[PDB]
């Protein structure tokens, strides 16, 4: 990565035992459960994009996933050529080539060339710019590798409503790879179990999550 | 983190591993009792409200909660809002919760002079949540802790101040009528300003 | 906690994963013998009253002795407010000692103060009172009823006798008479009658030699 | 390792007990699966060839691959000398004796001058060219190590499309030692490869279809 | 410990987590083995008196060895005291064991120049009783180990020089017959490889 | 050990637990297996004698090994001060030796690297002790009917390695050796390779 040094200066620093190890289990452990991006985004803090390619790289299994991402990466270059042409000529001294798409995806460009880009004056954030296609990508594996229609989330005659709802949400979350409506409010009342639907219905529209919980409990 | 390095400047530094990991592990180890929410608070020293939404994001089960959560932050976002309709741009309250700021503004703001504390507000904010989710999931009320017959005065204290941290006056009054016929007949007769050592010498 | 930094100031510093999980630990495995206070006194090295607090706090179980020990400061407070009673700077409340009615800014404020006040230090002073206070509570067994089994080794009923005795708390003179009176005494029969020949004045050494 | 340190200087850098533990458990355990070298390369970021040398010589059984290695090794040697007549004559103030193959390898040469080459303005880089001949080494162990063809993967009748693109892309990177695999070819090979409900419905995507339509497709 | 930082300057710092839990894990873990001496003296690398004797307390079991230990902590305090009965004040024995000096004295003597290593002599005596400690709680005697029948000469030295470590010629003389023979055919002044490698 | 501090000077630092647990670790699960003397080399770099004696005393099996190691340190010593404050065999071995006067040595200018030194002694009886707790010879090592040739030159090169404490081996002698001990299938088309054949090529001829 780069981070700031005690001098004040923005140096590369080796990526660690630790953050190598932390997220080939976190994939190991979790494969493409939502969470796992806030993850993978959090551990690649200060990120070269050659770091993200290492990252990425030490995933053993999962290769279906791992070459959707890279078509999904392709596409973005692809945009970013597009809408930033790369000019011809020599380069000023004192100046950087300008990067073309497969230089921020650590393809084409060296380890001195992505420093160089990143601690600019002003910088241009290739860490930064490959990491958001690099979410792109994984929210689609995500969104794909959802085990389970919200559809079929219907409480059990005997289920408390606590479990219920935390199977409602965590599928909900794998299906959009999201967390963030009155449509999924309406399935979840329509979903419940006999006594908590009626229970439920009671309270009235606009009622918070909060209320309903505290409304069916045991 | 925002932290004092050692030059004695303030400057922006990475979640680490070890921060990350510890957070994931105690939810998943305790679930919501009630000493998870310290631990929260001290894991998240001089956050972010970029770095509180890593750790909450980082929370794989739990949904229920994660999602009741959001919607505290919501109330408590609006609210600052209410109260708050070349001189610096003040935070929304989606500011706050990072929702609609960046990590460069989030750090303009907590190292601003005078600065505004939006991790810290924000970490309030999630606090607030997480003692509801704690009440809430509190497994029973303290009106139902009651002394065994044969259980130890000890083991029947430590059960009360558990149930009772869950969820000033519930204590003195409400430890004492839930024991057992002997004890709080003892106890009773220690009369008022008996301190918890010497009720639980007189039961022993 | 407050540490030295490079410039030479005391800065703060947040109170590590590593720290926090070891205490939680420590209190999960060795509940509240005696070992566990000197741990306790390490780990909060340096540390303010709020980190203090954070330790304490991130305790689980044993709800009944943190409520013991919440009591224990309170005395302490009342009577550090009753020893100090109401540009010179402001001096600490019981409370404030405590953590309950300062901030960290003002903690770091007298920590560092020249000549500092170490809230830090006597707010550990007093939970190490308390927790001296628990852990003789719960300290399993009189030293009266340790006594060396038949086939039990010497060295193992000396290790169950020296645990008891330090749980309990005796000042120096009684844990001499204890054992005095008690040691030897409450030896199974091989051991008693060769520790008798070895005659009086022998060291915890010659005796434990002698019966191994 | 040669590392910066806070005040923006290049210095030498004791191997850490995490690093050298790290390397040698990836390979009990992953033997020489493709992202073995990945983890090498990370591993030993900012390396000197001594380094280099002490993560090979700690691995404890593979002594084929190892025996291997050297061979490789020993020719990328040959042919940096070939390319790299070290001239005669002293060595000019304020520079270095160029660096021969078995100096590059750290055969015959001191740390001392591993750091001075590294550390030189400008660099001579001897730990990152060693590192290119290591990894051309175990790129081709990694072939060899690899169990199967990429002709031999065909979907189950009732395993499920996501599962058997999972072994063919997992194989096709074993055989080339390399993610860079998805041409013209691979891609007829993957359909015409595809249980026979599948092979119809994405034979009727037609031509320019991206896998992730393709595994919607077949769910 | 007190230590030397980046800048050049020795100052004190606080013991680390990981040094507390590797001694007490080295403790619960071999118990008085030998090689928990060498274990002991560089985990307290830079210590102070106090930092020696927070090792020493967070200690939970072996309270017999922990009480012989402070036994042999005040003679070695007591014989300190009878060699020693802008001038600085020098420590008593009570002081150099942390018992009667502030963590502020201790690092003012072991910080002074020139230093008086308060943290250094006490580590000696300290020593000198998990010596005595480590010499009692061994099992066997050495004249106790003798080579089985069917055991490899190689477990059987291993056995030999392990107890014999602990307890602080006779090792040809209780080897089986077979190697016996052989060892004292090598004659005098055989090395420990030679002999091995005779007996493999 | 010693290493560089921020003002560039070299500066005595403690030894770390984990460099203390990761040497007795891998002694308690790989004994004298070959690979052990690199690891330890790597794990004692920038080493004291001090720091030495530490990593050597901290073992607590293998106490044969550990006294013909003395015995070797003791020879070398005596060497030493046969062919020579300045240091005796005793002072390099950190048995006379403060850890002010090891570390004057090391760090002058020039230095006189006692670390370095006394690690070469180590290192030395360690290859005896690894020579030694050798299992096989490598005439015993033949190619199973079933056993994949791979798996055959793993155990030929490992044996190989053990008794010489060497991965320099590969003479022709060894070659010879290699070849004739290769199952009747392997051998015969080996053979058809002829001379000068390189161990990739023999390896992908036998898969």
Redesign the interface.
């Known amino acids: ?1 780069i ?7 923005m ?12 997220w080939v289990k976190v994939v190991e452990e ?1 494969a493409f ?3 796992v ?3 993978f ?3 690649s ?2 990120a070269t994009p050659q770091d993200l ?2 990252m990425l ?8 996933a ?3 991402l ?3 990466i392709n596409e973005e270059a692809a945009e970013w050529d597009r809408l930033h042409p790369v000019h011809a000529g020599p380069i000023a001294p004192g100046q950087m080539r300008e990067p073309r798409g497969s230089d921020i995806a650590g393809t084409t460009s060296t380890l001195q060339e992505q420093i160089g880009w990143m601690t600019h004056n002003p910088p241009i954030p290739v860490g930064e710019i490959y990491k958001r296609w690099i979410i792109l990508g994984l929210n ?1 594996i995500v969104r ?1 590798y959802s085990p389970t229609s919200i559809l079929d989330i219907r409480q059990g005659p005997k289920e408390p409503f ?1 479990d219920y ?2 199977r ?3 599928t ?2 794998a299906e959009q790879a999201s ?1 963030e409506n009155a449509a999924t409010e309406t399935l979840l009342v329509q979903n419940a179990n006999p006594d908590c639907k009626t229970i439920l219905k009671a309270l009235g529209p606009g009622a ?3 209320e309903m ?2 409304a069916c ?1 045991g």
């Open positions: 990565p981070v700031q040094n005690l001098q004040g200066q140096v590369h620093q080796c990526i660690s035992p630790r953050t190598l190890n932390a979790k459960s939502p969470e991006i806030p993850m985004s959090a551990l803090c200060g390619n290492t790289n030490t995933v053993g299994g999962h290769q279906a791992m070459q959707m890279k078509e999904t689609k794909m606590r709802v935390d409602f949400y965590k909900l979350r967390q918070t999550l909060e919980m505290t409990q």
